[PDB]
Amino acid sequence: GSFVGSIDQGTTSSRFLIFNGEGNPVASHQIEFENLYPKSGWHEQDPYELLNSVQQCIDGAMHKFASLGYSKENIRAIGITNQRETTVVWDSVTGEPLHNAIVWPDTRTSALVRELKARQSADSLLELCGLPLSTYPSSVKLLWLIQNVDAVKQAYEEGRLAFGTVDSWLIYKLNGGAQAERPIHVTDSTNASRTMFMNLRTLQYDDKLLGFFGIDRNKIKLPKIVPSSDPEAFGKVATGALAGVPIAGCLGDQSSALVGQCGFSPGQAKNTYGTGCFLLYNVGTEPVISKYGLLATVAYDFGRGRKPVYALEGSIAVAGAGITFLMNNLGFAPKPSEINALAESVLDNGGVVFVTAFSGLFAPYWIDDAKGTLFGITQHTTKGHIARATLEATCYQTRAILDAMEKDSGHKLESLAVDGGLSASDLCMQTQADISGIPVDRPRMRETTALGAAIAAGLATGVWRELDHVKESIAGAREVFYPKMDRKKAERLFRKWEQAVEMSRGWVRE
Amino acid sequence: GSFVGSIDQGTTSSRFLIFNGEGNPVASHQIEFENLYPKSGWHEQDPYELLNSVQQCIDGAMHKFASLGYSKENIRAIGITNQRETTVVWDSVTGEPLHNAIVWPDTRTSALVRELKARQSADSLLELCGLPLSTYPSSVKLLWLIQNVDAVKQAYEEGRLAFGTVDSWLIYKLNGGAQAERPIHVTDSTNASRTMFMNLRTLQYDDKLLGFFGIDRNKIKLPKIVPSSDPEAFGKVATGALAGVPIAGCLGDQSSALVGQCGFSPGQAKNTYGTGCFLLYNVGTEPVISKYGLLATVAYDFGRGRKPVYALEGSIAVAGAGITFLMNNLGFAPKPSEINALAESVLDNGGVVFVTAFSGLFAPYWIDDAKGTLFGITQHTTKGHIARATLEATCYQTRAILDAMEKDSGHKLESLAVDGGLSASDLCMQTQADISGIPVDRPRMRETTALGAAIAAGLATGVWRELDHVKESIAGREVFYPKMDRKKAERLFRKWEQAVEMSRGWVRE
């Protein structure tokens, strides 16, 4: 038949997958690449490590695709999904990087954020772009680069400086960056919504936003904002095993995950578990500015006359990191599987609640003076109770964020899909269904984020006619966990958690 | 030479030691005996298991003593020290136990305690006897026995019921219970101060106290209250390897530990480490009734015209039990040695504070709605930080109790002596000195509690002439000195008290 490829360029690993018409992979290749931490809190990557990682996964996956009897001519199109915010700067003329890419967790911008928050109009940014000032957005990373690296400052003033998120860099280079007929310098609405340069409501660059950061549109090269699904805006792969294959899809990774879960209606949510959590909440065609510190962002922009769809986003710092803490810091067990086994070994949390505020707590609590705080310990408390409480902590915080999304949105939570990391813990996802009072859907096909980009590319090139056809086609280990806990009991457990959170604030003094 | 024996009858162990004139043991024998836990919170012992364990230690220790070339004729007298409060009832005529002994931690009295506190006149008890109503004192255990066992009620109403703490039971039987010329049913001032039957200031049974519990002086046989050191009041061992050897000393175990530490001056304190802590604070010859829930009790009553000495007492639930918690519950390590090593692995607590209120917190905090609460956890927190915080928790609570004792008594803390259990941890002891700002004295000779009874018996029979002779004779690592800047110690204590305050209100029912 006909297949769709997906480049999934992540924070620590790259991937290329080839999906069939029902969204199941037939060929895959993964590579872990090098992350650089020059100074403390600094996080960098060689942009060519990102591109070459990807090119190696293309070569590997296509080597098997061939063993299956297929070639690039069997690939209708490829989509791209990427770690968001990570900032790349390159020379418009050479097409070469002027500095390393600054990865989204990088904290070098700390001081620069404090100054920008003091500036006039800082209060207006949230309503314009959907995000508040912080170290994460590409805006502060790009401005920091220009202010602290003389190559990129020089480049900026000479008019040769090009900016891009990872999607733009990959698409730019894959088309044969600079030395190419019709060079492709673009970014999709989801990725562009993460810079703080784009008006969330118009999906176009906003001069009041760019003006605040001091970036002149006439002097830097910004990627053209295009839909997440387009038959031509992204061009094609120039050389290699995919030479001549069109790129037709592009989505920020967390948005791509929502698409991979078919979260297309208002109130449909996804949670992706890793070290922490990234939750996205489909809010429909009108953006929602949060009153609870949630981010307003684009879910997907599939064009074809259809309105762009927005989302509310929240994140949790400690999910898998809590299991890691139990395994390494406390030595409970040497494998995460065995941590779950300990949690399953006991019937309940034993009264234990673990407010996993290692670095304080964020949305909807925003408690900066709590640390990790463990309540309910008695002589009868064993490793299993603490393991359970650690899994429960992520479920409570997930509910707290979803509860805020409901209030922000006005849309009742209609469904929750989970992928990655701790979602593999049957106990944890069963606990999530119990606590939130909603079924929890876990796809057996695990590459949800990669599939989102394939869906985007497939829609642009008639692999799928519409979004209803995507759902029906994708829907053709346990997969759905249904609430089994007495509601009165779920509410008591959630109130005990919220009690513990409140009792945790004010620990830290300065 | 002349030696002094000491019977040390404990909650889980019995032992007999023979001390020389310098307070060092030359023969020892220890036996672990059976404790019975019928239901949850119930704790019982066969009174003959205590006596037989003890008698077996006497025989064993005297076999080693003989190999040294000595016999009973070389032992001027023996002393007895015992687990307190543990309540024994036996038949006045036969001398046999009517029920098993109810050990001090037994909580079957909880409902009966609730009723007695609701009663009128309950507010008067503390100032009379020095203790408030709780599950621990023998009074509630005896009253429970009378109300729920018909062998005792009948024995009680028939006029045959004899009551005793473990000291009284042991001395009664060792002299030959019932069928003995001159039978001895006695108890010392320290043990008698623990029942709630005795006026603390007069050292005699109080009709208002006994009346409150409904115990009739003329119907039950109570032990005669005598000094902790007396040449005749305790009689002598009737049979066995010590037949004819006088009993001349008797002290509740925690008082005996203070004596064994030579804590004879006001402001001298001791802490004995086990599963928890028992701290005693010498307050001199006039008792101090606490305003912070500390117990007022008799330190020792050495008679010979001397006036009895009183103490303030406090206890901590989690000391050694905290190490056990790290080892077994959390699997940090398999041996206390290694838990200590982990705590030594780090330079400080890492910001971690462990309010070890597994069963709430007692004096001076009295927080009944807290549980164990661990603060300060980050991704940089390791087993060593938590192990350190666990040792620190006992030091912080030790200081809080000592601080309350100073305020109650008005006597400045002069010294702190430690024995048993966690006192072997140099780090814990050094941290205690750092936090309390006072030297911590740990005797190299380990049987501090047994020595106290030997001192009592030795004083009564001129092995030692005076307390100055006791001190000098025994004095013939050991001290931990504060090495932490007071500024840092006060910050650490303030973080602990912050954590304690942040812990209250956890339990909602």
Author numbering:
A (entry chain A): 65 to 540, 550 to 583
B (entry chain D): 65 to 540, 551 to 583
What do the paper's sentences say?
Here, we report the first structure of glycerol kinase from the thermophilic filamentous fungus Chaetomium thermophilum (CtGK). Overall, the CtGK polypeptide chain can be divided into two distinct domains classified by Pfam as FGGY_N (residues 65–325) and FGGY_C (residues 331–583) connected by a flexible region. A similar case is found in CtGK, which forms extended dimers via the interaction between the C-terminal domains with a prominent contribution from hydrophobic residues (Phe422, Gly436, Phe389, Leu394, Thr437, Phe439, Gly440, Ile441, Thr437, Thr445, Leu438, Ile450, Trp580).
Subsequently, by replacing the cryoprotectant solution with 20–25% glycerol, we were able to solve the enzyme-substrate complex with a clear electron density that could be attributed to the bound glycerol moiety. In total, three different crystal structures were obtained in the presence of glycerol, constituting 13 polypeptide chains. The substrate is bound in an evolutionarily conserved cleft within the N-terminal domain that opens towards the C-terminal domain. The glycerol molecule is coordinated by polar interactions with side chains of Glu149, Arg 148, Asp317, Gln318, and additionally with Arg148 main-chain amide. The carbon chain of glycerol packs against hydrophobic Trp168 and Phe342. A similar mode of binding was described previously for P. falciparum GK, where Phe271 and Tyr135 undergo shift upon substrate or cofactor binding. However, the movement of equivalent residues (Phe342 and Tyr200) was not observed in either of the presented CtGK complexes.
